[PDB]
Amino acid sequence: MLHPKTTEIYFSLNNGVRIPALGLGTANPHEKLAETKQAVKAAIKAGYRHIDTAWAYETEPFVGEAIKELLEDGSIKREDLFITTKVWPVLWDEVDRSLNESLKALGLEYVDLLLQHWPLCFEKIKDPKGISGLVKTPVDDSGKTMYAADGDYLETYKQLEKIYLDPNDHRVRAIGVSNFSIEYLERLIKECRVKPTVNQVETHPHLPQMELRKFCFMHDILLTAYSPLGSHGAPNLKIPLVKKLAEKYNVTGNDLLISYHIRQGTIVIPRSLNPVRISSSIEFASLTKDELQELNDFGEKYPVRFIDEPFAAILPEFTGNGPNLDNL
Amino acid sequence: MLHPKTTEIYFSLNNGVRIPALGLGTANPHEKLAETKQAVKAAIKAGYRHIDTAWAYETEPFVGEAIKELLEDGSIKREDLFITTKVWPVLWDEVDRSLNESLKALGLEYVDLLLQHWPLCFEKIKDPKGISGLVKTPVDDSGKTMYAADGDYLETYKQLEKIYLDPNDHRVRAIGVSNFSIEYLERLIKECRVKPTVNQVETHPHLPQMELRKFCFMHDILLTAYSPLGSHGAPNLKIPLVKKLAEKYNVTGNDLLISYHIRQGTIVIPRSLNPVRISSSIEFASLTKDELQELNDFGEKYPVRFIDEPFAAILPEFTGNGPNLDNL
Numbered sequence A, B: 001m002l003h004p005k006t007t008e009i010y011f012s013l014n015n016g017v018r019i020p021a022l023g024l025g026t027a028n029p030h031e032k033l034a035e036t037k038q039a040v041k042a043a044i045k046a047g048y049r050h051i052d053t054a055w056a057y058e059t060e061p062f063v064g065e066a067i068k069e070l071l072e073d074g075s076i077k078r079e080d081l082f083i084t085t086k087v088w089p090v091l092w093d094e095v096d097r098s099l100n101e102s103l104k105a106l107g108l109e110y111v112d113l114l115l116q117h118w119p120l121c122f123e124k125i126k127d128p129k130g131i132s133g134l135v136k137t138p139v140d141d142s143g144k145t146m147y148a149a150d151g152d153y154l155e156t157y158k159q160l161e162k163i164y165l166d167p168n169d170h171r172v173r174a175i176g177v178s179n180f181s182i183e184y185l186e187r188l189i190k191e192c193r194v195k196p197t198v199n200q201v202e203t204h205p206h207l208p209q210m211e212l213r214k215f216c217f218m219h220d221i222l223l224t225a226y227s228p229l230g231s232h233g234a235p236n237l238k239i240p241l242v243k244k245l246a247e248k249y250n251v252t253g254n255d256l257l258i259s260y261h262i263r264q265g266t267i268v269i270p271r272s273l274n275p276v277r278i279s280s281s282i283e284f285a286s287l288t289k290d291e292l293q294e295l296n297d298f299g300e301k302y303p304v305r306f307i308d309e310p311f312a313a314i315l316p317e318f319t320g321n322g323p324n325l326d327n328l
């Protein structure tokens, strides 16, 4: 049939390393953490060569088990895959520890990309039933987030740079950030040495993020789009214009919402636990400038930020109140 | 601006190795062999990751020198590149020798793809001014091509398999063929062991080669399209519908004649010595099923086979009479 599939497209990071434009997202519900394994296996067999995970997801062990099985049966080699993981704000000042923990969970010797997950620092609160004996997102009795006082979010990135630049340390192939604003990127660029290869952020037709895209392009940073379907229940499939363009280019809604990013040179990581959904939705709809313009217009007009949890409220672009339901 | 660029697309061979869909062709005029070096350097800086060459082109040393310079100044690593070369019919029964000669000329330890250039065997005629002391295409006093009588073209492919399957031999990563008909591929599949990863053939809107495409797809072989612009003088840019579709998708004629193949899952290797032409023509026109249909209609209606030299005449698909000028 017709090519490229979205599994066949590769963008270049600013250190010359290639990344598959399309990745599998694995921030799956706590109730279904084990189902990640089959989703990853299904993704790779359908041609995905990029898996996105994180220390905070609790899915690393299941991504690792899927990879181990495909390695062992000869379906894939390690060098064929691109694995991304992230350092959570609770370990903002212990990056070495986070990476080693992620490596142990994944059953891997290296990751391709290591991200600072948030420009945030959390206090370390003990919980034996938490991740690595720690509360994920600590709050006090009032219900507000416990940030590390005198914690600098840029300390995380500095620790990333050290590991990335150590010539006898082979644990990462690239570093980056997630949920950084233009202002935070500017501070990083001023104060740090290594240009982040990616800034991973929420974006899609309901949040086109034009300014950030422009900025990152100007400064040699690729966007990775998270929650491209709008997270729980994939509300972005129910946008009329999406349904319309999907129809024209003979693709599924998932395909179109994937292609919206890849067309603009944005890496994209839709999440699914559904093997047949993962497998089918690998078609490319090569949107016109004008069609992109329409899609972007829509998001300007009806902005919805689905990922805006309370812990993020202290950051300029975030409210902590979650999505504006009215714009749906 | 818009993605993918044709430099960003990768297809998968039947042994799991990825190949960039777009390659630089290097069958340059004997008068301009040296200019290949700058063309390869320009291709790679523009993002090409695939170079196509051959023992018979006399351009291997210049491809090698280009690569060596980009390796030395740190613009590329060897593992980033895909290099194809071929065994010419004069060495049909000396593949080890041809490979080693190619490796020496290229200044390389391995190639990614090694192809049988033609389903043909030539007599070895000495000429000190020829390639490796031999006449490239021997013709007798009557002007007839000197084929090795009692030479079986499939001996060449058998010698390819031996090297490809030797586990202590790392000189190749894939083997294939070029200029094979369906009948020849069928005989190969019946009598051999390794399925060719590619069959490299002339194809483009003036020679759609629908039947071969269908066959290779059914049998797990990718097509690589050679002479996609119609060879000397790039006559294929002058086709009206090609000029029309280029206009619509806002790309150049080269882009469109490139996109024609990539869209159908065909690897393509346009040749140029022009640095600005190579650099600009990396856009993708994602042709509709219908537009493909139109282009294919045109070639079925107006077949022109531009590569059809006398030596090829004994092969049932070829005439030896060169292109039918009438169909232009």
Ligand SMILES: NC(=O)C1=CN([C@@H]2O[C@H](COP(=O)(O)OP(=O)(O)OC[C@H]3O[C@@H](n4cnc5c(N)ncnc54)[C@H](OP(=O)(O)O)[C@@H]3O)[C@@H](O)[C@H]2O)C=CC1
Residues within 6 Å of the ligand: A024, A025, A026, A027, A028, A052, A053, A117, A178, A179, A200, A201, A225, A226, A227, A228, A229, A230, A231, A232, A233, A234, A237, A254, A269, A270, A271, A272, A273, A274, A277, A307
């Ligand atoms: N850097 C960061 O701070 C963040 C990063 N991310 C990353 O990005 C990834 C993607 O984002 P995510 O937040 O998961 O949300 P997505 O936009 O990818 O949406 C995922 C949901 O859509 C559903 N869905 C998919 N296809 C369909 C369909 N055809 N019909 C109906 N429902 C469908 C899926 O359910 P189903 O399984 O049944 O198909 C899934 O629950 C994450 O997994 C994570 O890796 C996410 C959030 C924050």
Ligand SMILES: NC(=O)C1=CN([C@@H]2O[C@H](COP(=O)(O)OP(=O)(O)OC[C@H]3O[C@@H](n4cnc5c(N)ncnc54)[C@H](OP(=O)(O)O)[C@@H]3O)[C@@H](O)[C@H]2O)C=CC1
Residues within 6 Å of the ligand: B024, B025, B026, B027, B028, B052, B053, B117, B178, B179, B200, B201, B225, B226, B227, B228, B229, B230, B231, B232, B233, B234, B237, B254, B269, B270, B271, B272, B273, B274, B277, B307
């Ligand atoms: N397997 C086999 O038996 C064969 C394989 N091949 C392979 O395929 C490659 C490509 O095929 P090839 O035969 O070279 O022919 P092509 O179809 O690629 O055409 C090449 C010619 O087109 C010209 N050209 C490119 N762009 C333009 C333009 N915009 N305007 C005008 N002219 C243009 C080039 O000149 P310029 O440099 O000035 O731009 C060049 O002379 C070969 O180099 C070789 O690697 C080729 C023949 C046989």
